[PDB]
């Protein structure tokens, strides 16, 4: 029976591949062939945020596009005012091993997590005037790799237990559990409508998940190594995955197969973080070679390089108005770019 | 000045936050970072209790005016290559190996625990992150190993072992096999200590090894080595 199930599964995979090939007549490279190239992209460093003493692992901007939050291995979660480089807040984390952080859309809460398998939500707007641990979420059996806020009460986290979770903060219990990944889930991205989300794992595949139903809508298998980053397109109909094979890949949900690959010969290091611009025309990807490339998403050509960090660029973010791009590296310095 | 009164007060708050961050960094910088690693039932728990007496679990203790933090990853069922870079820069790595499992084949398989331990030691020691980080090798369960080798030849684990079935010779042979896995002979040093569950000098040996590592780091900082 097991052999029959396996052959049924491989026949279904063959049917999947044939259906994907049938709905593939013009390559994205051919459609975006007569368009005007972006050209050289020159972005200069405008602000340098100093105060972190260990390597920075995470960063999130927020809706106001002015404040931001950074997480570093020294055990401090620092909320900066990027305009004036002022430190608005500095929360001492209970666990120094933090590798993810999120800033709530309302701004009243901030999330963090890491090797302790616990997602900590801190209340920023308190009557006492300080920052307190609003909630601690436990239940993941692996390290917390990413977390994103749906609203003030719902959060979505990814962990190294090949499982994603949707938590109700007030109760503190896992409202929904998304399972089906074979490898460690390393990053997740939330759709603009907050109804679907894509998670990339170490099984060299990405999965589009339905938040409400809890079912896996789609599965995309184009990469050849661990997927370390993922990010929706601004329209929410596509996404981009950076992986360890030194390539980025743009997939589309409606097409259901891979659209584009972003790679160059002199790049052999993996991608730690990816992000899109406001219009989605530019795809920014931080690499292990201490740099941060800027690709033309439509043309797949290299547009720019953000070479200002002395160590691996670990986290990348773009403001919701696209005003600036923040890069946090392992040299304990954040840099804003315009 | 262009700044407003509220802007000036915000800048003053930022300066106070900066000074608190600097104080915290100075407090943390004088504190030893030890990464505890080992195979299943290697003896990490016994080492933890020994240190205490004299996701991730952190053990804090003090010896000779030195504060030691030990990070026992332990129950982290995930790829080590995805979070092992977080421990780059620790003062030392304490690797625990159980001698008695040289002739025990229940890996989880048909390969003994000692081969798996040597594979893990090769992975950690020759990892790109820990090229300069010294390894503190703890060969635990020396008494049970000595009792075992009375009737269980080491040939079960090492078929090229022509030495006698004696505690000292076999122990030296096993130590040499673990030390030969160090490709980074010049950049790092392996400190070997033979321990059990009924000894109290383990913390003293860890203190001495950390002192040697600190002296070497100071010599490298001054360019004198």
């Amino acid at each position, epitope marked *: 029976e097991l052999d029959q199930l396996r052959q049924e599964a491989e026949q279904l995979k063959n049917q999947i591949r044939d259906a994907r090939k049938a709905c593939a007549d013009a390559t994205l490279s051919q459609i975006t062939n007569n368009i005007d190239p972006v050209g050289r992209i020159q972005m200069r460093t405008r602000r340098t945020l100093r105060g972190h003493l260990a390597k920075i692992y995470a960063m999130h901007w927020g809706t106001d596009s002015r404040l931001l939050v950074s997480a570093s291995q020294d055990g401090k979660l620092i909320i900066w005012d990027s305009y004036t480089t002022n430190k*608005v807040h500095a929360i001492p984390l209970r666990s120094s091993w933090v590798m993810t952080c999120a800033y709530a859309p309302s701004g009243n809460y901030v999330a963090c997590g890491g090797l302790d398998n616990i997602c900590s939500i801190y209340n920023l707007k308190t009557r006492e*005037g300080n920052v307190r641990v609003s909630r601690e979420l436990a239940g993941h059996t692996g390290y917390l790799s990413c977390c994103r806020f749906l609203d003030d009460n719902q959060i979505v986290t990814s962990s190294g237990d090949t499982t994603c979770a949707l938590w109700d903060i007030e109760t503190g219990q896992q409202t929904t559990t998304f399972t089906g990944h074979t490898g460690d889930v390393m990053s997740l991205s939330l759709a603009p409508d907050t109804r679907l989300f894509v998670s990339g794992a170490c099984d060299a595949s990405a999965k589009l998940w339905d938040v409400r139903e809890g079912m896996c809508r789609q599965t995309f298998t184009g990469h050849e190594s661990d997927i370390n980053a993922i990010c929706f397109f601004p329209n929410g109909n596509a996404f981009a995955t950076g992986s360890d094979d030194a390539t980025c890949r743009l997939f589309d949900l409606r097409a259901d197969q891979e659209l584009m690959t972003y790679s160059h010969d002199n790049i052999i290091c993996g991608i730690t973080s990816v992000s899109f611009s406001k219009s989605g025309r530019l795809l920014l990807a931080g690499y292990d070679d201490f740099n941060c490339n800027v690709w033309d998403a439509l043309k797949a050509d290299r547009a720019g390089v953000l070479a200002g960090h002395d160590n691996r660029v670990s986290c990348l973010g773009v403001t919701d108005d696209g005003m600036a791009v923040a890069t946090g590296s392992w040299d304990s310095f954040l840099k804003i770019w315009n | 000045c262009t700044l*407003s009164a509220e802007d000036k007060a915000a800048v003053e708050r930022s300066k106070m936050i900066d000074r608190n961050l600097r104080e915290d960094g100075e407090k943390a910088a004088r504190e030893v970072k030890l990464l505890l690693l080992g195979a299943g039932e290697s003896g990490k728990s016994t080492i933890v209790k020994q240190m205490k007496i004299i996701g991730i679990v952190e053990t804090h203790f003090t010896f000779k005016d030195l504060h030691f933090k030990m990070f026992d990853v332990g129950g982290q069922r995930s790829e080590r290559k995805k979070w092992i870079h977080c421990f780059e820069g620790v003062t030392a790595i304490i690797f625990c190996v159980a001698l008695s499992d040289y002739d025990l084949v229940l890996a989880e398989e048909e390969m003994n625990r000692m081969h798996e331990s040597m594979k893990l030691f090769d992975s950690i020691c020759n990892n790109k992150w820990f090229t300069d980080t010294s390894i503190i090798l703890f060969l635990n369960k020396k008494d049970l190993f000595e009792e075992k080798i009375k009737k269980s030849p080491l040939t079960i684990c090492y078929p090229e072992y022509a030495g006698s079935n004696t505690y000292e010779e076999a122990a030296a042979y096993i130590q040499c096999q673990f030390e030969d896995l160090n490709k980074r002979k010049d950049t790092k040093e392996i400190y070997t200590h033979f321990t059990c569950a009924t000894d109290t000098k383990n913390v003293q040996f860890v203190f001495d090894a950390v002192t040697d590592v600190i002296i070497k780091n100071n010599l490298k900082d001054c360019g004198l080595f």
Partner: single-chain antibody
Amino acid sequence: DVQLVESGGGLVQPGGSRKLSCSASGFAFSSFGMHWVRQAPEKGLEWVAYISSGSGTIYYADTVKGRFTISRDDPKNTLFLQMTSLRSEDTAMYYCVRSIYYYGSSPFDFWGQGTTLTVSSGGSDIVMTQATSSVPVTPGESVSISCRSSKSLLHSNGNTYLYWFLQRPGQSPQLLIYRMSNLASGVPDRFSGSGSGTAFTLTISRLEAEDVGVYYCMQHLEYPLTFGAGTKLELK
């Protein structure tokens, strides 16, 4: 919840000295700057002194400069005001006010109850004008409280440093609007702040019985903070 309790007030001979202490509980005292503000027996509010968090920055009013000294004991969470050579102009009720400054913060959140001191019997400062002394009002109606400034309170960073306070009869003032637009926490959405430049208005929609009181207009651009003369409301 958070509270500030003032003590040390009483009848003192003019030319003497007196120590006032404000005890703070329920909040991080060391992270809040502290202001001392008097109110005359039948007149409006008047800023007196200020000490920043960590005692780094200290300011005094021109009337009280030299004679008074403001200090804070963070470990025991107390705010001290020493007063020497007291004149007949210092008979007032004093309030200690907490105020934290960062991006998006609301200064002057909480006011102390105040302590009464009664002794036996300028220029280069922005003057805040509230010409309307008092108007009758009917519950459930809409009233607008106007404010005037001699110098524009809008800064180059886009913030208009105007604060609105309400003082109910027999109660300490509380913050309603901070920076001319934002509503303070716990304030009903009835109150709306507006204005631009040197003229400002405060709008109350469908007011009720506990909206009766004196409304004060205070500036925070140049640090010699000045309050308005006051615009009190009466029911019909």
